[PDB]
């Protein structure tokens, strides 16, 4: 999550295919969930805080 690449992330690029997601929070490139625009770290964190609505902890 170097600063430039978070910005580059947003720049609509020369080709449709250099489209890639980062975390709306940390900017992490790698484990980013479509649906939240968050990584699997941030997901975990915000989920526990209670700030992802209707997101319960599973158990079956």
């Amino acid at each position: 999550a170097r600063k430039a690449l978070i910005e580059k992330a947003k720049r609509t690029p020369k080709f449709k295919v250099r489209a890639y997601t980062r975390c709306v929070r940390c900017g992490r490139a790698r484990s980013v969930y479509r649906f939240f625009g968050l990584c699997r770290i941030c997901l975990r964190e915000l989920a526990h805080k209670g700030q992802l609505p209707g997101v319960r902890k599973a158990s079956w």
Partner: protein, 99 residues
């Protein structure tokens, strides 16, 4: 004639709201097919717990969108004029299609 779908995350509020609608349609002159429990669509998420390595521990989260149908056959006017005066739970979405 009037068909109400009820989709929300919390099933207490979702179920409550649908009682507020089975009764609304009673005290206005009509018969009703009750609040029907449509199946519920779960979205799971399976995150590695730690930040770095350690793949052999995850945590399981889910996202449960609950679904209730309700039908009011023989739909009067004293019905509708008691429905656009309700709204009482926040995390419940309503969609009405006269089919």
């Amino acid at each position: 004639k009037i068909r109400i779908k009820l989709r929300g995350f919390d099933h207490k509020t979702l179920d409550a709201s649908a009682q507020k609608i089975v009764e609304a349609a009673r005290r206005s002159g009509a018969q009703v097919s009750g609040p029907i429990p449509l199946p519920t669509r779960v979205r799971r998420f399976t995150v590695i717990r730690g930040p770095f390595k350690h793949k052999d521990s995850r945590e399981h989260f889910e996202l449960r969108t609950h679904n209730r149908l309700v039908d009011i056959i023989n739909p009067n006017r004293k019905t509708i004029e008691q429905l656009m005066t309700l709204d009482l739970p926040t995390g419940v979405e309503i969609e009405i299609k006269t089919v």
